[PDB]
Design a protein around this ligand. Structure first.
Ligand SMILES: Nc1nc2c(c(=O)[nH]1)N[C@H]1C(S)=C(S)[C@@H](COP(=O)(O)OP(=O)(O)OC[C@H]3O[C@@H](n4cnc5c(=O)[nH]c(N)nc54)[C@H](O)[C@@H]3O)O[C@H]1N2
Ligand SMILES: Nc1nc2c(c(=O)[nH]1)N[C@H]1C(S)=C(S)[C@@H](COP(=O)(O)OP(=O)(O)OC[C@H]3O[C@@H](n4cnc5c(=O)[nH]c(N)nc54)[C@H](O)[C@@H]3O)O[C@H]1N2
Ligand code: SF4
Ligand code: SF4
Ligand code: SF4
Ligand code: SF4
Ligand code: SF4
Ligand code: SF4
Ligand code: SF4
Ligand code: SF4
Ligand code: SF4
Ligand code: SF4
Ligand code: SF4
Ligand SMILES: [Mo]
Lengths: 79, 65, 438, 321, 131
């Protein structure tokens, strides 16, 4: 239930934070999908986090490790 | 000359820790197998007829000549 | 608020077609664009502009630039194309495949030199394809099967942004359900690029030594790799052996290359040693080279002129009944150097900006015509600037992806009242030339 | 107000030091963030409900800087030291004044875990397998280093007691032990020891199940955070061997799983993992507090997506009936 | 000093051109040297200061910065465009691909000199610089 922050100023729209998030990958890549909500979607060229109320993230670091030009900061402390 | 018996070897380093010819590579440990498995590599450029490592092996896995 | 699905982004080789546009109520303003990268977002934001060129514009004696009618511009271009002795038409990176067929017809009538951005970009690669072949694949193949991925001399993060998230690394395919975590990504280039950040290996090679690197790899593959020196091209022999072992054990590999190979010493020999390496790896594994083509339809001129004249680029259409091709002799840059031209036509490119300035200086001695939708350097040093529709935003058509798979682009905005598209324009030029009876 | 109950929480390098000042008496709950494994056996056990669990996967992978695996509310902590006794991999220590001091053990008010380690030195042969397979750095083998990798400990020929001929019996040069405060009872070293000379017994007993068909692929967080490396990504078969069975996405080795819980705390999925412990093995008699702690540790749990926002910044699992 | 050099891409550069080749964004994105920190110290180049990149086939005054994409000691880099092609040598090796990456160049710290805009560069190379 952590909080992710995306630096819009250096986001290129690469979409490798959307493809690599394992909560996004739940809908289409799971047998009998449990939850179909998504943290990121690239609207107007930058990654927007729809997870406003910080309910779905799990601090995995797959998205921080994925962005090619580090731009996603993961906060492990309560918002 | 040298010959290991992979049938009776446990990949214990006590055979490659002695001679500079025997280098024992343990390929990475994965729960897949859940076992230790590697290879014993012996080079001519360093041996002797010392035969100490024959009986240093816990098992009788090494015969040399 | 009229959401339009399945649009095409007309900039990089990826030809991404998963773009969603929310066009305004009146169908002429783009409000929000989803699923596209920034470079693309800006293309659409520019296409939906309110203040854009609508009529041609001529250079008066005073040096300013005033508008003229389309028929007058067509008359000018037709008369000049016929009066010239060896005109050169260059560009075609950013146009539909009907735009690259109409141009072929126009210059068949004229008799000049017809050429595209292949010469200055991946034409050294084609010259290697001619030597060794092109063991390749479509991009869904690497999406659904690839176990090892090599980016040799390329930089997808900044060249093709959504290449990694669409085709190569992160997608979870069919036989690659585990996604990235079972893909081994190797990136080779002297810089520590963002692709190398995402990668798992990195072979920081001295710039220019890729031929020695490839030869080292291929000696390893052929089996007696013990005869390698201590280090090769700045890469250390143990790392060479590591990457080579991974390549041998790959279930299905894929190599991508770019300017690191096509713009350095031994332009085409780097590419053909790469292709030889791929053909050698297919002895024990499955490996497929693949070229990182730049513009959307830059593989479009290749195929269209392949079916029309048999030659992808550097076309010698002066005999009027048999064409010739020799890149060292018929290419745009070499002809500009040896002042072998009489007229330069800027169609779907920016020659002034992206050519060497000695070549631009040599070319400007002659008349200069630009067919672009918007202002750029060529349209600023041209003699007349004919507007034209933008592919994928104002006009649709076929385009050709990196791997020669035809995507069908759609139209989202109607072009400004009066502006025609290149296929209509080139056809009108050809009709007028035939009217002038030559 | 009043100042002297000074509550402080400082991140001194890699140790998060949680402190309570007085004039002369202090209290230092020190968490070593290089050894924490993200299990919650410190949050389940806290009598005073202060320890919460944070971004386990990110911290255990190195992608998080402003947090540890666990957050302790040092205003609520009581410095009992139950967390220090009940943490399987000792990554929490209590220092009262300046010394590691556990009053509850000094008074024998709490049982401790019976990891029960031992290496019968009359059977071990100085092999190198047990140090090699150990997921944590807990095998202290004290052996002279022969010509392998170094200058001779005695000599290649003195690694075997030879009269210079025949060997005289047995060699066994040196001594090998298991740092009992670091072993997590994974049993990689007992299962793989050549001479069956290692005696370790798992602290927890139960069962863990993996529903592979619910893993969304490229999320090897569970693999990355498992302390005992029980988890694996099942290797994809080659062609001409797949035989119509495609592959699994994730699986576990029940021989090595120690029922810690880091996998469950780290998985971002919904219910891929099912964890349930049945019996903790202790020495020391018992307590009503220990019965409560058993009841807390033995409730089955599984992952969850979309937990409540009011507790954002921590983990909440699913209670399985 | 010989300081081998390459010319490559960047997303900010692509973004800039699609904003427009005559825009402040394009100026800012392309007029850039991305060299090594060790080389900057050894030459004597203050970070973020104009510098004279002079190869055998031209010359250009370009801002000198340090790039995240770590160039090893002895490498330079200009994002491709007007400024880089003011200095790219035209040699093709009978292939039609000019030496776009890997040509020697000397670098001279020359602050207090302005940068030349894209229009000024091209229209003055041709001889059309009205403004
Ligand atoms: N220093 C350096 N310079 C280089 C290179 C390098 O590596 N280093 N690489 C060289 C290579 S790889 C090439 S590709 C060039 C690339 O450079 P270019 O091929 O010139 O690419 P653009 O400048 O983006 O050209 C886009 C122009 O075409 C217009 N356009 C878009 N759609 C259409 C259409 O449908 N019809 C028409 N008629 N026009 C359209 C666009 O508005 C724009 O004016 O860069 C080259 N220059
Ligand atoms: N934003 C933006 N995107 C683009 C373009 C653009 O201009 N701007 N251009 C488009 C077009 S026209 C092109 S052709 C494509 C091509 O783009 P790419 O083919 O992907 O190549 P580059 O982006 O120029 O980066 C090439 C990499 O090779 C490295 N390199 C340089 N020399 C060597 C060498 O000697 N050996 C090795 N192993 N590596 C070397 C370079 O450091 C660089 O990391 O991008 C397209 N995408
Ligand atoms: S940390 Fe994991 S779950 Fe959270 S947004 Fe990133 S990839 Fe998704
Ligand atoms: S991966 Fe990074 S650059 Fe790409 S969209 Fe996400 S935040 Fe932006
Ligand atoms: S030869 Fe003996 S000591 Fe050496 S690896 Fe084999 S079994 Fe172990
Ligand atoms: S016989 Fe002696 S010298 Fe040869 S490998 Fe064995 S121990 Fe070493
Ligand atoms: S990668 Fe290229 S084609 Fe795809 S959205 Fe980005 S700019 Fe457009
Ligand atoms: S119980 Fe687990 S989370 Fe708590 S301190 Fe010990 S290892 Fe860390
Ligand atoms: S010392 Fe006791 S109260 Fe404090 S965190 Fe540990 S278990 Fe909880
Ligand atoms: S694995 Fe067993 S025999 Fe080998 S060193 Fe360890 S305790 Fe001794
Ligand atoms: S039980 Fe596991 S952690 Fe303990 S000594 Fe053996 S291998 Fe190491
Ligand atoms: S497999 Fe066992 S030891 Fe590993 S994280 Fe899961 S419960 Fe813990
Ligand atoms: S079990 Fe959890 S950590 Fe492992 S792959 Fe599935 S979602 Fe990712
Ligand atoms: Mo290109």
């Amino acid at each position: 239930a952590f909080a992710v922050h995306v630096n819009m100023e250096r986001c290129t729209g690469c979409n490798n934070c959307v493809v690599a998030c394992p909560v996004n990958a739940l809908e289409l890549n799971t047998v009998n999908p449990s939850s179909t909500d998504k943290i990121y979607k690239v609207i107007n060229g930058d990654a927007v986090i729809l997870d406003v109320k910080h309910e779905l993230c799990a601090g995995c670091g797959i998205c921080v490790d994925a962005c090619p030009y580090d731009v996603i900061q993961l906060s492990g402390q309560p918002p | 000359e040298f010959k290991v018996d992979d049938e009776k070897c446990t990949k214990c380093g006590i055979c490659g820790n002695l001679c500079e010819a025997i280098n024992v590579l343990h390929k990475p440990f994965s729960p897949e197998i859940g076992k230790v498995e590697g290879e014993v590599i012996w080079d001519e450029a360093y041996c002797d007829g010392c035969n100490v490592c024959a009986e240093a092996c816990p098992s009788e896995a090494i015969k040399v000549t | 608020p009229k959401v339009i699905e399945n649009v095409g982004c007309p900039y990089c080789g990826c030809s991404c077609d998963d773009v969603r546009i929310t066009v305004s109520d009146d169908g002429k303003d783009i409000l929000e664009v989803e699923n596209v990268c920034a470079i693309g977002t800006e293309i659409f934001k520019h296409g939906c502009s309110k203040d854009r060129i609508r009529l041609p514009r001529m250079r008066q004696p005073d040096g300013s630039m005033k508008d003229i009618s389309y028929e007058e511009a067509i008359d000018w271009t037709a008369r000049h194309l016929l009066k010239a002795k060896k005109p050169l038409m260059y560009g075609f990176g950013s146009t539909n495949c009907e735009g690259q067929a109409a141009a072929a017809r126009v210059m068949e009538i004229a008799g000049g030199m017809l050429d595209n951005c292949a010469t200055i970009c991946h034409g050294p690669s084609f010259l290697a394809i001619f030597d060794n072949g092109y063991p390749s694949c479509t991009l869904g193949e690497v999406k659904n099967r690839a176990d090892v991925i090599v980016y040799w001399g390329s930089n997808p993060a900044h060249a093709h942004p959504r290449h990694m998230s669409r085709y190569s690394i992160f997608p979870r395919g069919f036989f690659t359900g585990k996604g990235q975590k079972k893909r081994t990504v190797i990136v080779i280039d002297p810089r520590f690029t963002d692709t190398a950040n995402v990668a798992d290996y990195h072979l920081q090679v001295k710039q220019g030594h890729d031929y020695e690197l490839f030869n080292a790899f291929r000696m390893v593959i052929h089996g007696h790799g013990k005869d390698l020196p201590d280090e090769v091209a700045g890469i250390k022999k143990e790392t060479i052996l590591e990457v080579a072992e991974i390549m041998k054990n790959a279930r299905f590999g894929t190599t991508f290359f770019g300017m690191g190979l096509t713009h350095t010493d031994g332009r085409n020999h780097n590419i053909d040693i790469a292709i030889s390496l791929t053909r050698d790896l297919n002895k024990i594994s499955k490996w497929t080279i693949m070229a990182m083509r730049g513009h959307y339809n830059i593989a479009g001129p290749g195929v269209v002129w392949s079916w029309t004249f048999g030659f992808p680029y550097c076309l010698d259409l002066t005999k009027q009944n048999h064409a010739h091709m020799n890149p060292g002799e018929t290419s745009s840059v070499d002809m500009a150097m040896r002042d072998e031209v009489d007229m330069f036509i800027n169609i779907g490119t920016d020659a002034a900006a992206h050519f060497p300035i000695p070549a631009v200086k040599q070319l400007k001695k002659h008349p200069w015509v630009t067919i672009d939708p918007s202002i750029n350097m060529a349209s600023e040093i041209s003699d007349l600037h004919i507007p034209v529709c933008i592919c994928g935003v104002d006009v649709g058509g076929i385009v050709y992806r990196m791997d020669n798979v035809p995507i069908q682009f759609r139209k989202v905005i109607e072009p400004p009242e009066g502006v025609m598209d290149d296929e209509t324009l080139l056809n009108k030029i050809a009709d007028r030339m035939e009217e002038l009876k030559a | 107000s009043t100042l002297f109950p000074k509550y402080s929480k400082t991140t001194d390098g890699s140790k998060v030091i949680m402190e309570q000042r007085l004039l002369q008496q202090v209290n230092n709950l020190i968490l070593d963030n290089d050894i924490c494994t993200g299990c919650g056996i410190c949050s389940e056990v806290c009598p005073e409900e202060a320890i919460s669990v944070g971004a386990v996967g990110g911290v255990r992978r190195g992608l998080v800087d402003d947090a540890a695996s666990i957050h302790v509310d040092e205003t609520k902590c009581s410095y009992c030291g139950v967390c220090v006794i009940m943490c399987p991999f000792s990554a929490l220590a209590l220092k009262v004044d300046g010394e590691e001091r556990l009053p509850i053990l000094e008074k024998e008010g709490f049982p401790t875990y019976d990891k029960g380690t031992a290496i019968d030195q009359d059977k071990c042969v100085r092999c190198n397998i047990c140090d090699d397979v150990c997921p944590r750095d807990a095998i202290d083998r004290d052996v002279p280093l022969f010509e392998g990798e170094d200058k001779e400990g005695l000599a290649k020929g003195q690694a075997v007691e030879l009269k210079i001929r025949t060997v005289v019996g047995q060699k066994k040069l040196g001594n090998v032990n298991i740092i009992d405060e670091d072993c997590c009872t994974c049993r990689w070293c007992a299962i793989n020891c050549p001479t069956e000379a290692i005696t370790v017994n798992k602290i927890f007993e139960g069962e863990i199940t993996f529903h592979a068909e619910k893993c969304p692929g490229g999320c090897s967080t569970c693999v990355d955070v498992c302390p005992a490396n029980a988890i694996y990504l099942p290797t994809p078969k080659p062609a001409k061997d797949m035989k119509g069975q495609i592959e699994a996405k994730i699986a576990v080795n029940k021989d090595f799983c120690i029922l810690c819980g880091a996998c469950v705390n780290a998985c971002p999925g919904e219910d891929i993992i099912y964890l349930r412990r049945d019996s903790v093995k202790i020495k020391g008699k018992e307590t009503d507090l220990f019965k409560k702690i058993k009841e807390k540790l033995f409730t089955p749990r599984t992952s969850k997506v979309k937990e409540q926002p009011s507790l954002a910044g921590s983990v909440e699992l699913k209670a399985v009936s | 000093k010989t300081l081998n050099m390459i010319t490559q891409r960047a997303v900010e550069e692509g973004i800039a051109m699609e904003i427009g080749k005559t825009s402040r964004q394009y100026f800012d994105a392309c007029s850039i040297i991305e060299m090594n920190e060790q080389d900057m110290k050894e030459l004597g180049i203050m970070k973020n200061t104009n510098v004279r990149v002079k190869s055998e086939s031209g010359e250009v005054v370009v801002k000198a910065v340090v790039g995240r994409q770590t160039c090893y000691p002895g490498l330079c880099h200009i994002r491709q465009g007007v400024w880089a092609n003011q200095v790219v040598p035209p040699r093709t090796q009978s292939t039609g691909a000019p030496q776009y990456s890997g040509f020697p160049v000397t670098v001279e710290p020359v602050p207090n000199e302005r940068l030349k805009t894209a229009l000024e560069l091209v229209q003055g190379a041709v001889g059309m610089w009205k403004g």
